[PDB]
Amino acid sequence: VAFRFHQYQVVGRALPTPGDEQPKIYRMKLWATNEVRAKSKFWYFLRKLKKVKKSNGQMLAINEIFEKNPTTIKNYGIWLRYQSRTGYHNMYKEYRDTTLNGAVEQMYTEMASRHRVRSPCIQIIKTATVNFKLCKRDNTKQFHNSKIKFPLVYQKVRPPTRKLKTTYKATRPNLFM
């Protein structure tokens, strides 16, 4: 269903000028929540990297990329640049998820939790699939095993829909894992 991020690719170039009548072309792969935010981030990176502003630039194409096999789990790596309270740093993060799109969500959530870093402070330098037997993080590496088995230490007791739930119940619930 709905994904809070979408990996667009934005293609843009400076406006035509009398010399250099075909200005050179730049492509980028940006995460955002929708088109207009992806575009606004694209001009950010071509105004702090390639010295081109939206006024003196022009956007030619924006595509929304999707994922190949949503049904399979893919060990993802993200190399990311972030701002702490007193400087900048560089992180590497390994996730297991069915899509890069979900991995990015999981990664913003992890940076907002482990470091109180918000979205406006985070950059995704490079994203890739770091397939198994080459993963680096222990929490990724420990799910690389068939014949895996673990019981559920944490299982909310909860009625299937809001209708079936009342305030008094005779019997103390039987919880067992």
């Binding site: 690719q9 492509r27 990329i65 190399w79 490079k126 890739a128």
Partner: protein, 48 residues
């Protein structure tokens, strides 16, 4: 409703092939990634 010729032959196999090839070419260039043979300091961190 009773499986009449609902959308039938609309375009031929050579056209439906070149269209698919152009789409896949745009997909290759649309998910293409960077070389990273520029940043001689973060080579080992970036993996390349």
């Amino acid at each position: 409703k009773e499986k009449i010729n609902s959308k039938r032959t609309k375009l031929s196999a050579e056209e439906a092939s070149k269209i698919k090839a152009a789409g896949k070419a745009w997909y290759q260039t649309m998910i293409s990634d960077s070389d990273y043979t520029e940043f001689d300091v973060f080579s080992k961190w970036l993996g390349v």
